[PDB]
């Protein structure tokens, strides 16, 4: 009963991987864009936005 | 005298060196073992 969950997680993860690769040249810039607050950690509202 | 996996002009799809296909042993190790001192000459070695 978790097949829809696994499919949606896989689709979102692959889409985020390709979007990060196409937008950000490096990985530190991607992390700093994902985390706007500068605390060093990524929160749930940061992830959803 | 040619091994079956020697590098050549044949076009093959190359994977990482973890995968045991083609030439992997020759790429796993490192080239450099080049440390020595100059061992001087016959003349100074012999004539004391």
């Amino acid at each position: 009963g978790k097949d829809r969950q696994r499919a949606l997680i896989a689709a979102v993860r692959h889409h985020l991987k390709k979007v990060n690769y196409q937008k950000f040249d490096t990985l530190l810039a991607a992390f700093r864009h994902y985390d706007k607050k500068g605390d060093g950690m990524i929160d749930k509202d940061e992830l959803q936005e | 005298p040619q091994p079956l996996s020697t590098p050549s002009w044949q076009i093959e799809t190359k994977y990482s060196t973890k995968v045991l296909t083609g030439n992997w042993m020759e790429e796993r190790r490192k080239f450099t073992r080049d440390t020595d001192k100059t061992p001087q000459s016959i003349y100074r070695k012999e004539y004391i």
Binding site: T26, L27, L28, F31, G40 | S16, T17, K18, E27, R28, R29, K30
Partner: peptide
């Protein structure tokens, strides 16, 4: 990226066996 802490010293590994490039721990 090595200068910029977020990553522990154990997190950096060589990419392959006897290779110059550095990557992260999986």
């Amino acid at each position: 990226e090595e200068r910029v802490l977020l990553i522990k010293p154990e997190d950096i590994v060589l990419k392959e066996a006897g290779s110059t490039e550095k990557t992260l721990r999986t």
